[PDB]
Write a protein that binds this ligand. Structure first.
Ligand code: F43
Ligand SMILES: C[C@@H](OP(=O)(O)O)[C@H](NC(=O)/C=C\CCCCSSCCS(=O)(=O)O)C(=O)O
Ligand SMILES: C[C@@H](OP(=O)(O)O)[C@H](NC(=O)CCCCCCS)C(=O)O
Ligand SMILES: O=S(=O)(O)CCS
Lengths: 259, 550, 442, 442, 50, 51
C-alpha cells in the first residue's frame, strides 16, 4: 500500500501539523467538558430535547436506484434527517494550538461529511447536528486542539486573532463570551458562541501554560519556531509553485524536466 | 381666433403674431441677453483666476450671435418665463435631479426573504421586526455601519437624500407598519386608482431604496443595484439575528436581494454598451409610470403632456444630448414640446375632434380612423404654423414642427382607439403628410424611423415588433435620432389616459415614484423645470462639506 | 493515430465494457454521440403554451411585475396545442425528409420543438432556432385564433418579451439550453451554459450519468474555446475520460475503497493508485523524510487527481447526504494532496481557485444561490477548464432534499423536455457505445 | 415546391444561362453554393505574418499607439512562413483528410488558414476558428523560434491584441470576415457584420459580383434572424433573386436603358417594365387624372423595385464615378417612385429610412463615415432587411478614388486573403451553378 | 463625416475600453483601464529617480 | 445662429491641449495650448518620448 506522510519539515510546528493531519494520532486530552455543556455553549438546541429534522429519515423518503450513490455509508445524522449546524473557532496568532488552515485540513482529513471554511481570523465547520456535537466534544473541545485562553468558540463578532493578549493571556473578545476566574484560575463561558448569555457559566478548564503552547502550536513565529529554521517547508512550497507555473505554461513531460 | 399659444407669442414677440415682417441686425449681438453678459463676466473672472490666462469663452470667434432677437421661453401651464440658456440640462439643476432620482431608484420585493426567514431560517417575522429592519436599512443605506465604530462611514450630511421606503398591497400590514418610512397607497392615490393598484400588486410587500445621488454622480448607473443589494443584505443579517449556518445565509441572500429586484433600465448592448439604470434602457411605459399626473389630474391631455415633457427632458436633452452626442446639446429640440402651449393647443384640438367624431374611446382600432384623425390633426397643426408667422419663428427648426404635429396626431389617435401602436402609426402618417405639405421635414436623416415606422408600427417580426409601452431608446429604429422618444412616451401614456388606467406598464414603479421623499416631485415636471431654470431648485449630490470654502 | 493512450471503458455499475479503447475514441471531434448531443442542444427549443395563455389572458406582457392594461387576449392555446403544433411544424418545415420535430408535452401545456438542421447549416450561430420558433409560433397563433392586426405586437411580447429593447428573452415563454451569444463570459463560452441542476434533472438524478453529462459539455466547450489545441488536447481528453466516463473504473474504485472514509482517505487511495500505476515517482527524500513526488506522466496525473476529486466529492456528500460540501471538499482535497505529495493539484490550482469561488458564492451573505446553479459561463466559476463543475453534479445527485435550489424547483421543464432523448438521459452509456463504434478507425 | 413562380438566370455580362428555374433553387436552405459559402466563411482566418513580425520587433503590443519597452522579440516570421504554416496545419489538423489548408499569400507575408469543419461541428458558434488559429500560431512561433517561457505572453499579445481584457481582436494581427459575437447589435446578426469594404475587396472591385456577395450574405442573415420564415420567405427569396442575381436580367437591362440617364429615368424604366410584365395594374384614376397603381404581385413588385434601386445606384455613381451619392440615390429613387405611382417603396419605406439615416451619418459630425465602413450590423444600416447594402457595395465598386476610407485603406489583409478563394471572389457565377445543379429537384 | 469617423474611432485614444456583455459597462470606466495605462498616468517617473 | 451655451463657471476645468513630437512645429505654436515635452520632461526622457 502507501504509508502516508502528512507534512514536510523537521521543526516542532511541522510535527504538530503532521499530528493534527494524522487520523491515527490520538490527540492528548487536557480537559473534560460534559456533552451537555458543549451543547449549551454551542447554543443551537436545548440539551435533553430531540434533534429537529430537515427531511424524513432516509428510509422513509424514496430515491431512484443509484449504485454509485449507495456505495457510501451515510452519517447517522443524515440517516435520521437532522439540520446542518456549525461550530466556529477563533485562533490567536500568539501560539494558539490550532490555526485556521491547519484546522480545516485536519477536519477534512479526520471527519466524515463536514464542510470546513477558512478565514484569516475565523474557521467554521458545518455538519449534521448530532455528529457535529459528537466530534465537537470528542476532538474539538477536550483535546489539545483547544486552549480556552488563546482560542475561543465564537460566532457573530470575531476579532482579535492578530491583537495582543490581555492581562490574563486571553485572546481579545468584543463580546466577552469567556472570562477568567482568578479565584479558581479557570476560564468560564458566560455566553454561548453567538452571544446570548448562559443561565449557568460552564467551566472549560484553565489556560494552557505558555511553555506547553510553544510546544503544541502550529504557527510559525520569529519569537517561536521561524520558517527560516524549517527550510524543508519552504522548498516544498516553492516546488508546488514551480509545478503550478510549469503546468499552466505548457503541461508536457518536457516542460516539467525543468522542475 | 383664440389659441393657447397666443399669450406666449404676445409676451415673446413685440410685433403682432400675425405680422409677416420685422427688422434685424439692431439688437447689439450677444449683449441683448443678460445670460450671455453674465457668462462673459464669469468667463473673464474664471480665466484670470483659475485658468492662468488660457482663454475659455470667446464670443468674438465663430457665428456672430444675436443677429436676430433671442426669444425668451415660457413653460407650458406655468406663468413664468426663462431664457433658453437656463433650460440647458447642464445649467438646469432640476433636469439633473430629474435624472438623478430615476437613476438612484431600485425596487426590491420582500416576500421571498420573509418566507425564507420564517421556514428555512426558523426566525419569526412580525411587523415589529419589519420596523426594526426598516430602521436598520435606513441607517445603513447611505453610509452607515451598524454597531461598528471602527468601520469607515460616509459623512451623513453628504447623503441627506438617501431613503429606504416600504409599501405593500396588504392593508393590515400597511397600517401595522411605521408611517415614518411607508409609502401609503391609500392616502397617495384616489380610491379607484388605489384599488386598481392594490389588485395589480397583490398582497406582497416591496421596499424602495434611494441610493444617495453622490454615488451615481461619482460612479455610473450600474452601481445603484449593487449598492442597494449590499446594504439590504447587511441590514437583513443585522436586524434579524439568525443562528443557522452559512449556506442557508446564501439562500437567504438570494431570496432577499436577487429574487424580486425591479430596475429602472436594462443594460444596452453593442456600441451603446452601458450598465443598467441608464436613460437608454428605460422603456416608454416605465417612464409613463414614473410621471405621477394620473394621481392629481383627470385630464388625459395634461397627463400625456407631462409625460411628453419628462420624456423630452430625459431622452432628447440628457440621453441623446450628452450620453450619445455631447456638446451644446439638444435643448431647443425638447423645449419645443413643453415651452409654449403649442403642443397643448394641438393636443386639445385633437382631443376635441376625437370626442366630437368618434367619442372618448368609442371606436376599435382600424386603419380608417387612424388615417382620418392623424390627417385632420396634422392639417390643423400645419395651417396653425402657416397663419401665425411668430409661431413659425418660435419653432424655427423643422424637426422642433414635425415632432409637435406628429405627437398631437398620435395622442389624438390613442385617444380615439386606446391602442398605442395605432397612435404611433398615426404619428408616422402625420410625419409623411407633413413632408408632403411643407416640402420639408427635420434634419438629414432624421426621418429614418419615420419612413421605416409605418411598416414597423404593426409588424410581427422579431426585431420589429413590440408594444409601444415595451419600446424605448434601445429599439433599433429609435436608437439614434432626436425628437421622437419623448413624444413616443407621451403617446404610450395617452394610450392609457383614454381608458383612465391607474398605470401603464408597472404598478410598482408607479407606487415607488409617488414617494413624497423624492427631491424631484414627478407630479409637475414642468413646474420643477421652471423652478430649476430660475436657480431655485435644491439639488442633491453636492460635496460642500468635504471641500474648502476658499 | 497520434496518442498511444489506451483506456478501458466501464459502465455506471462498475462492469467492464471494452478494453484497449483508443483515447481519441471519446474525443468530441470523433465521438458521434457528442456530435449528436451538440446538434440537438443547438436545435432544440422549449415552448410554454400555458405560460403564453396566462400572460395573454392577464396582459402580463413586460417582465417582473409588469402588466399592460387593455392589451389582453383571450385564446385557448393549451386547448388547441395540436393545431398550433401542426401549424408551427408546417411553417418550420424545410423539406419532406426533414426533422422538424414538434411534440406535445404535459398534455398540451408545453411544446418541444426541434428546428431542422437545414436552417442551422446556413446559420453562423445557434440563435436561429429560438428566433425561427418564435416567428413560427407568432404566425401560428395569429392564424389559428383570428388575432386582429393591432394585437400582433401583444402576441410577440407574450412569446419573446422585450427583445428589441432588451437584447434577450426575459419575460418570454420560449427557452433554450444556450443563452444569447452576446451574453457570454468569453469567446467560445456558449457550451458552458447548462447549470448543474439541468444536468441532474435531465439524467434523472443519476450520479454517473450527470457527471458524464457535465464533463462532456465542459470538455467540448474547452475544445471550442481553443484551449484543447496542441499540447493541451491530451490533458483535456484524459480529463474527460477519467473524470466523466469513469475510465479504468477509477471513480467507482475510489468510492468503494472509501465507503466509510473521509477526504484524506480518498487522497491516500488516489496517491496509492498513482504510485502503483507508475503515474508518479519519488523525486527526492528531504532531510526530514518526506520523499517528494514528481509526475512520470503529467497529464495522466492530472486525470487521476480529477477522478479522485470526483470520488472525494461523492464520498463526502454521500456521508453527509447534503450538497453543500462541494466547495470545501474540492478546495481541501487539492490542498491536502499538494502538501502531502509536493505535487500540483487538479488543473494546477485552477480547481482550488474555482472551489474558493464556489465557497464565497454559496456560503455567505455575499454568497448568492446554491451549488445547483453552477455553470462555466459565470465570472465566478469560469476559471477551471472543465475540472471543477462535474463533481458538483455528483454532489447535487447525493443531496437528500436539503437545498433551496433543488433540481425539481429549477429544472422541471428542462428535464421533461430533454429526458426524452436517450443520449441526454444516459450520456454515459451512449457515449461509451459511440466510442465503441469508432474503435477500429484509429 | 411550394412556390410556383420561375425565374431566368443571367450572368454578370447579361448572357442567358437557363430559363424556368424555380425560385427555391437560389434559396439559402437549398442552394449548395450558399451553404458552402456560409460554411467556409466561418472557418477561414486571415493571418498577418508581417504585422506579427513588425509588432514583435518594435514591441507594438497594446493597440493604438501603445508600446511596451523591454518586451521586444526579433523573429523572422516572413522568412520562416512555410515552416510556420506547416506547424499550424499540423496543430489544426483533425485526422488526415479534413479540409485543413494553410496557403501562402504575398510570398509568406500573409497566411490564409482554414480550420477543419470537424472542429466546427461540435462548436456552438464560429469563434472556434479564430481562437484555434491563435493558439496554433502561438505554439508554432514558440517552437520555431525558441522563445523564452517569459515571452509567450508577448507573443500572445502580438497575435491577439487585448483579448482577455477587451473581448475582441483589436491590436492583433489575426482577422476574419465576421466580427466578434460581442459586437452584434441583435440576435442572428452574425452574418450582417461584414463591412462593405470587406465585400468590395473580396470581390476585387467587381460591381455585379460584389452585389451578389452582399445580397447573398444579407438574405442568408435574414433567414438566420428568423425574418424570412412563413409568409415572409417569398419576399426575401425574390429580393435575393432579382436584387443580387439579376434573375430576369433586370439590373443589366435597366442600366443599359439608362446609360446616359438620371434616377428619374431609371424610375420610369422600372415602372414601364413592371406594367409590361403585369406586376402592377391601375387601381383607380383620380379626379386630377393621377393613375394610382396597385400591385398584382406584392413580392414581385418589391423585387422589381429593389432591382431598379440597384440599377439607379449603379447609373448615378457611374456617372459621377464617386461613391458618396449612394444615400441620396437610395432615398430619392424610392421618394420619386412612391409619388409617381402611389405604390410603396423598395422595402415599404424601410430602405428609404435607411437612406435618411445614411445621409445623416455620411455627411455630418455625429458619427458614421465613408459608405465603405457601413454594414448590416451597423446601427445606421440595420433597418432594411437585405435591400440597401448591395447598392452600397455596387457604388463603392464604381468609385474612382474620392474616398479616404477606401477598401485599400480599411480591408487590405482581409481582402487579399479572401480574394484567393473563387467562391468568395465570384459568388455570382457559382451561385448560378449551384442553382442549376438543383434545378430539377423541385 | 471623415473628420467625425477619425475623431470618433480612427485616431482616438480611450483611457478605458468598453466592457459589453456580462460586465455591461461603457468606455472610460475604471474596469477598462489597463495596468500599464494607469502606470503611465502617474507622473512620478519624470520628477523622481527612485 | 440662436444657440444656448453652458455656464463657463461650470466648465473652468475644461481644456483642449495640443502636444507634438515635431520640434519645428512645436516651436511656432501658441504656448498657451501647448504641452511642452521638452519643458516637462528631463532630456533623456523627453528624447525617448519624442522617439
Ligand atoms: C453644423 C450642423 C451639422 C451637425 O451635425 N450639426 C449642426 C450644428 C450642431 C451643433 C451646433 C454647434 C454650435 O452651436 O455652433 C449642435 C449643438 C450639436 C452639438 N452637440 O455640437 C447642434 N447642431 Ni444643429 N441644432 C439645432 C437645429 C438645427 C436646424 C436649424 C434650423 C434652421 O433654422 O435652418 C438645422 C437642421 C436643418 O438642416 O434644418 C441644424 C443644422 C446643423 N446642426 C448643421 C448645419 C448648421 C448651419 O447652420 O450651418 N441644426 C434646430 O432646428 C433647433 C435645435 C438646434 C440644436 C440645439 C438646441 O436645441 O438648442 C442644434 C444642435
Ligand atoms: C461576483 C461577486 O460574488 P458573488 O457572486 O458571490 O456575490 C463578487 N464578490 C462578492 O461576493 C461580492 C462583494 C464583495 C464582498 C467581499 C467583502 S471582503 S470583507 C467580508 C469577509 S467575510 O464576510 O467573508 O467574513 C463581486 O461582486 O465583486
Ligand atoms: C451611429 C453611432 O455612431 P458611430 O459611427 O458608431 O460612432 C452612434 N451615434 C449616435 O447614436 C448618435 C445619437 C445622438 C446624436 C444624434 C442625435 S439626432 C454611437 O455613438 O454609437
Ligand atoms: O442638419 S444635420 O443633419 O447636419 C444636423 C442637425 S443638428
Amino acid at each position: 500500500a502507501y504509508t502516508p506522510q502528512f507534512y514536510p519539515g523537521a521543526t516542532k510546528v511541522a510535527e504538530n501539523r503532521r499530528n493534527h493531519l494524522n487520523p491515527n494520532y490520538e490527540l492528548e486530552k487536557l480537559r473534560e467538558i460534559p456533552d451537555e455543556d458543549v451543547v449549551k455553549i454551542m447554543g443551537h438546541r436545548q440539551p435533553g430535547e430531540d434533534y429537529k429534522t430537515v427531511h424524513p429519515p432516509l428510509e422513509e423518503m424514496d430515491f431512484v436506484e443509484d449504485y454509485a450513490r449507495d456505495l457510501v455509508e451515510p452519517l447517522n445524522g443524515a440517516k435520521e434527517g437532522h439540520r446542518v449546524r456549525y461550530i466556529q473557532f477563533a485562533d490567536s496568532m500568539y501560539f494558539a494550538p490550532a490555526q485556521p488552515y491547519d484546522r480545516s485540513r485536519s477536519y477534512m482529513s479526520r471527519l466524515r461529511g463536514v464542510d470546513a471554511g477558512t478565514l484569516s481570523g475565523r474557521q467554521v465547520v458545518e455538519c449534521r447536528e448530532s455528529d457535529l456535537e459528537e466530534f465537537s466534544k470528542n476532538i474539538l473541545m477536550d483535546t489539545e486542539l483547544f486552549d480556552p485562553a488563546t482560542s475561543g468558540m465564537r460566532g457573530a463578532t470575531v476579532h482579535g486573532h492578530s491583537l495582543r493578549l490581555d492581562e490574563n493571556g486571553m485572546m481579545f473578545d468584543a463580546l466577552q463570551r469567556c472570562v477568567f476566574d482568578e479565584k479558581t484560575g479557570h476560564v468560564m463561558y458566560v455566553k454561548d458562541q453567538v452571544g446570548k448569555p448562559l443561565d449557568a457559566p460552564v467551566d472549560v478548564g484553565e489556560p494552557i501554560p505558555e511553555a506547553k503552547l510553544r510546544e503544541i502550536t502550529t504557527i510559525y513565529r520569529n519569537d517561536g519556531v521561524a520558517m527560516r529554521a524549517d527550510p524543508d517547508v519552504i522548498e516544498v512550497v516553492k516546488r508546488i509553485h514551480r509545478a503550478r507555473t510549469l503546468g499552466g505554461y505548457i503541461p508536457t513531460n518536457e516542460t516539467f524536466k525543468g522542475l | 381666433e383664440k389659441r393657447l399659444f397666443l399669450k406666449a407669442l404676445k409676451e415673446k414677440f413685440e410685433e403682432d403674431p400675425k405680422e409677416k415682417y420685422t427688422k434685424f441686425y439692431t439688437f447689439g449681438g450677444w449683449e441683448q441677453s443678460a445670460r450671455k453678459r453674465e457668462f462673459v463676466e464669469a468667463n473673464e473672472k474664471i480665466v484670470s483666476e483659475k485658468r492662468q490666462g488660457i482663454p475659455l469663452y470667446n464670443p468674438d470667434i465663430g457665428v456672430p450671435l444675436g443677429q436676430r432677437k433671442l426669444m425668451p421661453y415660457k413653460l407650458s401651464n406655468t406663468d413664468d418665463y426663462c431664457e433658453g440658456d437656463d433650460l440647458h440640462f447642464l445649467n438646469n439643476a432640476a433636469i439633473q435631479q430629474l435624472w438623478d432620482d430615476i437613476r438612484r431608484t431600485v425596487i426590491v420585493g420582500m416576500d421571498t426573504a420573509h418566507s425564507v426567514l420564517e421556514k428555512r431560517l426558523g426566525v419569526e417575522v412580525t411587523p415589529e421586526t419589519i420596523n426594526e429592519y426598516m430602521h436598520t436599512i435606513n441607517h445603513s443605506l447611505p453610509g452607515g455601519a451598524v454597531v461598528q465604530e471602527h468601520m469607515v462611514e460616509v459623512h451623513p450630511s453628504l447623503a441627506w437624500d438617501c431613503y429606504a421606503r416600504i409599501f405593500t398591497g396588504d392593508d393590515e400590514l400597511a397600517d401595522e407598519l411605521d408611517s415614518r418610512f411607508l409609502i401609503d397607497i391609500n392616502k397617495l392615490f384616489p380610491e379607484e386608482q388605489a384599488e386598481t393598484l392594490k389588485a395589480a400588486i397583490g398582497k406582497k410587500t416591496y421596499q424602495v431604496s434611494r441610493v444617495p445621488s453622490l454615488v451615481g454622480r461619482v460612479c455610473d448607473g450600474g452601481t445603484i443595484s449593487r449598492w442597494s443589494a449590499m446594504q439590504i443584505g447587511m441590514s437583513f443579517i443585522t436586524a434579524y439575528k439568525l443562528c443557522a449556518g452559512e449556506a442557508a445565509t446564501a439562500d437567504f441572500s438570494y431570496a432577499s436581494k436577487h429574487a424580486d429586484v425591479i430596475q429602472m433600465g436594462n443594460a444596452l448592448p453593442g456600441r451603446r454598451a452601458r450598465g443598467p439604470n441608464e436613460p437608454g434602457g428605460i422603456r416608454f411605459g416605465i417612464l409613463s409610470d414614473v410621471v405621477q399626473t394620473t394621481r392629481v389630474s383627470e385630464d388625459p391631455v395634461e397627463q400625456s403632456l407631462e409625460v411628453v415633457a419628462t420624456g423630452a427632458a430625459l431622452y432628447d436633452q440628457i440621453w441623446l444630448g450628452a450620453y450619445m452626442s455631447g456638446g451644446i446639446g439638444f435643448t431647443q429640440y425638447a423645449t419645443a414640446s413643453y415651452t409654449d402651449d403649442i403642443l397643448d393647443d394641438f393636443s386639445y384640438y385633437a382631443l376635441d375632434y376625437v370626442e366630437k367624431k368618434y367619442g372618448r374611446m368609442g371606436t376599435k382600432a382600424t386603419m380608417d380612423v387612424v388615417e382620418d384623425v392623424a390627417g385632420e390633426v396634422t392639417l390643423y397643426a400645419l395651417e396653425q404654423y402657416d397663419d401665425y408667422p411668430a409661431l413659425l419663428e418660435d419653432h424655427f427648426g423643422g424637426s422642433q414642427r414635425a415632432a409637435v404635429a406628429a405627437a398631437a396626431s398620435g395622442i389624438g389617435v390613442c385617444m380615439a382607439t386606446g391602442n398605442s401602436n395605432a397612435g404611433v402609426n398615426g404619428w408616422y402618417l402625420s410625419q409623411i403628410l407633413h413632408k408632403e405639405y411643407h416640402s420639408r421635414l427635420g434634419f438629414y436623416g432624421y426621418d429614418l424611423q419615420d419612413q421605416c415606422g409605418a411598416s414597423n408600427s404593426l409588424a410581427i417580426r422579431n426585431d420589429e415588433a413590440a408594444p409601444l409601452e415595451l419600446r424605448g431608446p434601445n429599439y433599433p429604429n429609435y436608437a439614434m435620432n432626436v425628437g421622437h422618444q419623448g413624444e413616443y412616451a407621451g403617446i404610450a401614456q395617452a394610450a392609457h389616459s383614454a381608458r383612465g388606467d391607474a398605470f401603464a406598464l408597472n404598478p410598482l414603479v408607479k407606487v415607488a415614484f409617488a414617494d413624497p421623499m423624492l427631491v424631484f416631485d414627478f407630479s409637475k415636471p414642468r413646474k420643477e423645470i421652471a423652478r430649476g431654470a430660475l436657480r431655485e431648485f435644491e439639488a442633491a449630490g453636492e460635496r460642500d462639506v468635504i471641500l474648502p470654502a476658499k | 493515430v497520434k496518442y498511444e493512450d489506451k483506456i478501458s471503458l466501464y459502465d455506471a455499475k462498475g462492469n467492464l465494457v471494452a478494453e484497449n479503447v483508443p483515447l481519441e475514441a471519446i474525443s468530441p471531434l470523433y465521438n458521434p454521440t457528442i456530435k449528436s448531443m451538440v446538434k440537438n442542444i443547438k436545435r432544440t427549443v422549449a415552448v410554454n403554451l400555458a405560460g403564453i395563455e396566462g400572460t395573454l389572458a392577464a396582459g402580463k406582457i413586460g417582465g417582473k411585475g409588469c402588466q399592460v392594461p387593455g392589451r389582453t387576449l383571450d385564446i385557448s392555446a393549451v386547448s388547441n396545442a395540436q393545431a398550433i403544433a401542426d401549424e408551427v411544424e408546417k411553417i418550420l418545415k424545410v423539406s419532406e425528409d426533414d426533422d422538424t420535430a414538434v411534440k406535445i408535452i404535459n398534455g398540451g401545456k408545453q411544446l418541444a420543438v426541434q428546428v431542422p438542421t437545414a436552417r442551422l447549416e446556413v446559420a453562423a450561430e445557434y440563435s436561429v432556432s429560438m428566433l425561427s420558433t418564435a416567428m413560427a409560433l407568432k404566425e401560428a397563433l395569429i392564424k389559428t385564433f383570428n388575432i386582429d392586426m393591432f394585437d400582433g405586437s401583444t402576441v410577440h411580447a407574450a412569446i419573446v418579451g422585450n427583445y428589441p429593447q432588451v437584447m434577450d428573452y426575459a419575460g418570454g415563454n420560449i427557452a433554450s439550453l444556450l443563452g444569447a451569444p452576446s451574453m457570454m463570459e468569453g469567446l467560445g463560452y456558449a457550451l458552458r451554459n447548462i447549470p448543474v441542476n439541468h444536468a441532474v434533472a435531465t439524467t434523472k438524478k443519476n450520479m454517473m450519468n450527470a457527471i458524464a453529462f457535465s464533463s462532456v459539455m465542459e470538455q467540448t466547450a474547452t475544445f471550442e474555446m481553443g484551449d484543447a489545441v496542441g499540447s493541451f488536447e491530451r490533458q483535456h481528453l484524459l480529463g474527460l475520460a477519467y473524470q466523466g466516463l469513469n475510465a479504468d473504473n477509477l471513480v467507482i474504485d475510489f468510492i468503494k475503497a472509501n465507503a466509510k472514509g473521509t477526504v484524506g482517505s480518498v487522497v491516500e487511495t488516489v496517491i496509492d493508485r498513482a504510485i502503483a500505476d507508475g503515474v508518479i515517482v519519488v523525486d527526492k527524500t528531504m532531510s526530514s523524510g518526506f520523499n517528494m513526488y514528481k509526475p512520470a506522466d503529467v497529464n495522466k496525473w492530472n486525470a487521476y487527481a480529477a477522478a479522485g476529486l470526483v470520488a472525494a466529492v461523492a464520498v463526502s456528500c454521500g456521508a453527509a447526504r447534503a450538497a453543500q460540501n462541494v466547495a470545501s471538499v474540492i478546495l481541501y482535497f487539492n490542498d491536502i494532496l499538494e502538501y502531502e505529495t509536493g505535487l500540483p493539484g487538479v488543473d494546477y490550482g485552477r480547481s482550488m481557485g474555482t472551489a474558493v469561488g464556489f465557497s464565497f458564492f454559496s456560503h455567505s451573505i455575499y454568497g448568492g444561490g446554491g451549488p445547483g446553479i453552477f455553470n462555466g459561463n459565470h465570472v465566478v466559476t469560469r476559471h477551471s477548464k472543465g475540472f471543477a463543475i462535474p463533481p458538483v453534479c455528483a454532489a447535487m445527485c447525493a443531496d437528500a432534499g436539503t437545498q433551496m435550489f433543488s433540481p425539481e424547483h429549477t429544472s422541471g421543464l428542462v428535464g421533461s423536455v430533454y429526458s426524452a432523448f436517450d443520449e441526454f438521459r444516459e450520456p454515459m452509456k451512449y457515449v461509451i457505445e459511440g466510442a465503441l463504434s469508432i474503435k477500429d478507425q484509429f
